[PDB]
Structures are given as C-alpha cells and as structure tokens.
C-alpha cells in the first residue's frame, strides 16, 4: 500500500538475515533452512566486509520471495524467546516428577498422545531414575531423560 511501508518491512527482514549469519555453526543446523539458503550462509561470514553487504543483499533477496514465519518461529525457539517454547519446557519438566516418582501412571499419556514413544526404553530409564534417587546417588542419568523427551518433542524420527 506504500513503497516505504514495504521498505521498512524489507529492512526488518534484512536485519533478521544479518542475525542468522551471526549465529554459530552448531546451532545453525537446528532451523529448518533450505540447502540453497544454507550454502549461502557459510560463505557469508568468510567473505570480506563489503561482500557481506552483497551477501546480505543476496540473503534478503530469496528470503522475501518465500514464506518467513516458520523460519522466524523456528529461530524464536532456538533463542528461547517465543512464548510457546518456554511453556513447552515448563510442561516437559512438569511430567518429569509426574513420571520419575511413579513410573507407571504417567506413561499412558505419552503413548496415547505421542505414537513415536519407545515404551520399551522409557520404563528402563525410569528404573534407573528410581534407583539413583533412592540410593541418593548423583543424577548422572536424569539429564538423559530430558534429552529423550526433548528429542521426541520435535519429531526426532
């Protein structure tokens, strides 16, 4: 509706692209980014400062022509700034004590709602979780419980 209205909208997308290049390689693969865009990211930091502007012009160019919300939404989870991400972790730890203290009454909800949960391994993990807590041993396996639930949270496959 206004040429300058598009301008600030496009410029806002430009600084978003400048945030992707300023993000580490290990966390770069987390976002569902296409290979064509991904390949342009690695060349962006290794190019000289003036070429970064051209690369920033590149990154903005084919990022506007496609959908942006899933990329922005996925980036928000990694930054842990989207509201649904932090509450998801709240319920993820809310089912820990619901499961680590009983071990039988909490598995029903997980299997009924999530069909990719390996109940063969989950029961054994709770067996170790009960053993370490009862024997007042350091929680060397409690961390792995959260990783498995977190991994299955976003379709581990």
């Amino acid at each position: 509706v206004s040429k300058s209205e598009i301008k600030r909208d496009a410029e806002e997308l430009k600084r978003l692209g400048a945030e992707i290049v300023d993000l580490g390689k290990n966390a770069l693969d987390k976002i569902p980014l296409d290979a064509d865009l991904r390949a342009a990211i690695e060349l962006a930091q290794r190019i000289k400062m003036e070429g970064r502007r051209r690369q920033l012009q590149l990154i903005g160019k084919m990022l506007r022509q496609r959908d942006v919300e899933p990329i922005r939404q996925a980036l928000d989870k990694l930054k842990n700034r989207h509201n649904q991400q932090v509450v998801l972790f709240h319920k993820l730890e809310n089912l820990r004590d619901r499961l680590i203290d009983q071990g039988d009454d909490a598995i029903a909800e997980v299997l009924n709602l999530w069909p990719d949960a390996d109940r063969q391994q989950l029961r054994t993990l709770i067996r170790n979780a009960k053993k370490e807590k009862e024997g007042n041993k350091p929680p060397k396996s409690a961390r792995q419980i959260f990783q498995y639930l977190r991994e299955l949270a976003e379709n581990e496959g």
């Binding site: 509201n83 649904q84 509450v87 998801l88 709240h90 319920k91 909800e109 709602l113």
Partner: protein
C-alpha cells in the same frame, strides 16, 4: 444453588495461557470473571490439587474438576395505587422510584413483578400487558390492557397515533409562549445513558403549552405523541430550558437571585425529576366509548408550586 460436578480435560491448543481462559472455551456458559472468583474460593482442583494463583500457565494433560454450585421473574409485593380495575383495562398510578420493566440488577420489585403478584396468570400476555415505557424517577398514570385482544388494538392505535397523552412538568426559565418541537433523536455518541438530539436520528414530534409562570421557573402542561425513552426531557432541554431537579438531563443547579432558605431546601428536597401524567384518554376495546381519568397532583409537586408561588409573589411584587 445448583451443586453439579464439572470435570473436563484441557486439550493441547491451550498451550502457554492462563487458568481463567482455559476453563472458558471448554465451559461456554461460564466466562472468565465467573471462573475467577471460584478459583480464589479454593473450590477448584487441578491434577487433584487445589490452586491459589489464577495467573498460572497450564498447557495440557491435566484433569480439572469443579465441585461447586451453579445456580421467569419472581414476583414481589409492591404497593400500587389502583385507579381503575376491571376485566379489560387496568389504570394504575405509578409511584416514585418504580421502573416499569425489570433489568439486570432488579429481578423483583418492579411494575411487572408487582402485576404478577397482583394477578398471577397475567404472564400469558406479552410483557404483562404494558404498552408504553416511562422513567422510574417520573410518576404518572400507566395503562395496562387486561385481555389480549385489547393488546392488539392498543398497539395499533399508537402506530396510527390515536391515543392522546398529557404530561405535567416544571422547568427553569421565564417562559413566553408554547409551540411545537420536531427534532430527530438517536443515542448519545459518548455516554450510554443519554439519548441526545441528533440530526440523523429517529424523527420525533412533541408539543408543549404553558399554564402559568414563576420567578425563574414555570408550571406547564403538554402532550407527548411518541412515548420513547426520555423523549419529553430532551425536547424540553433542546430549547435550553431544562427540567427542574432532573439530574441526568436537566442543567446544573441555578437558584434564583434573592432566594429564601426554604426555597433552596425545596429544590434539595425535590431531588427527583419534574414530570407527572394527569389526564389519559383511551378507547374501550369491545365497546367503543371514550373513558377519561385524571391524576391528582403529587404532594411533592403541591409544595413545589406552593413555595414558588410564595417566592414569586414576594420578590417580584
């Protein structure tokens, strides 16, 4: 009190939101504020545990159980001054502070509830047989047809504007002569309890006459055609001559020069609207013979005109 259990399971699309909202969609009949007060009452269990913090974030996999109570108009005994009562028409003199139709906040104690107590099966006719509305702060005559064929004839008469209605009012200012006012009216743009004159409003016609004047006030007789909500007040106020003692539509208090202490007390004592209906004319449903009735001047108006008569005869004379 209706003690009925209420247990439901929250779904997975209420993620990251509070407690008051979550129960609202799953229970459409109860909204957030109704849910809020019962949460503070320590009578709602979530996951088998009672909660005290309505601003908690609940996502899913929880079983909420509400174990508490839940819950046309009950008639009430109200004194009514019957003027004329028979099998077809009911003429009643409505006293002060009595609304003709109950609303949200007055389940019992109104004209309709009193008429229900006065005659139990009166609920058969719609609206218990009332045909026109009137302000509760204004006393006057009210007409109710007993039988339902009389309801059809009465509403059709007002559509053709056949029934004549008369009002007695007291206003401020030294009036000069009568006349007619024709100004469209709609709702006030800002305040929701005011019905102000609007050029693109509903067309309206009202006539006014004068019987005698006073110092800075007047006693006047007038006829109203359409009995809409507060029609008579605004059309009298659109000529910047507001009614005496009207708190909503009348102007700010303005005692006259050299007013006695008793006169100022009377305006304070007369803290209601200056309106009264004296003479009503109707056509009988199954006979076709006119009836005429008159309403005595209420005691507050008797002293109001008395104090103004003494003041006018003492200062100006």
């Amino acid at each position: 009190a209706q003690r009925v259990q209420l247990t439901a399971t929250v779904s997975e699309n209420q993620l990251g939101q509070r407690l008051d909202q979550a129960l609202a969609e799953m229970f459409p009949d109860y909204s957030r504020s109704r849910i809020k007060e019962w949460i503070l009452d320590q009578r709602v269990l979530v996951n088998g545990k009672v909660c005290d913090k309505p601003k908690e974030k609940v996502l899913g996999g929880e079983q909420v159980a509400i174990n508490a109570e839940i819950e046309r108009f009950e008639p009430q005994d109200i004194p009514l001054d019957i003027v004329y009562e028979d099998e077809d028409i009911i003429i009643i003199n409505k006293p002060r502070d009595l609304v003709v139709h109950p609303g949200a906040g007055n389940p019992d104690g109104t004209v309709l509830n009193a008429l229900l107590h006065y005659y139990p099966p009166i609920a058969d006719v719609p609206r218990a047989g009332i045909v026109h509305r009137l302000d509760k702060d204004t006393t006057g005559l009210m007409v109710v047809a007993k039988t339902v064929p009389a309801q059809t004839r009465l509403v059709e008469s007002l559509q053709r504007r056949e029934i004549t209605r008369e009002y007695e009012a007291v206003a401020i200012g030294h009036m000069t002569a009568g006349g007619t006012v024709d100004e469209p009216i709609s709702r006030h743009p800002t305040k929701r309890t005011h019905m102000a004159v609007h050029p693109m409003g509903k067309p309206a016609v009202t006539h006014y006459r004068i019987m005698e004047h006073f110092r800075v006030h007047t006693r006047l007789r007038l006829r109203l055609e359409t009995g809409r909500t507060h029609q008579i007040r605004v059309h009298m106020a659109h000529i910047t001559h507001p009614l005496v003692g009207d708190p909503v539509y009348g102007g700010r208090p303005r005692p006259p020069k050299g007013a006695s202490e008793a006169f100022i007390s009377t305006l304070r004592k007369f803290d209601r609207q200056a309106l009264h209906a004296t003479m009503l004319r109707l056509y009988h449903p199954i006979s076709g013979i006119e009836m005429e009735w008159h309403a005595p001047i209420p005691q507050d108006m008797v002293e109001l005109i008395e104090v103004m008569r003494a003041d006018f005869e003492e200062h100006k004379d």
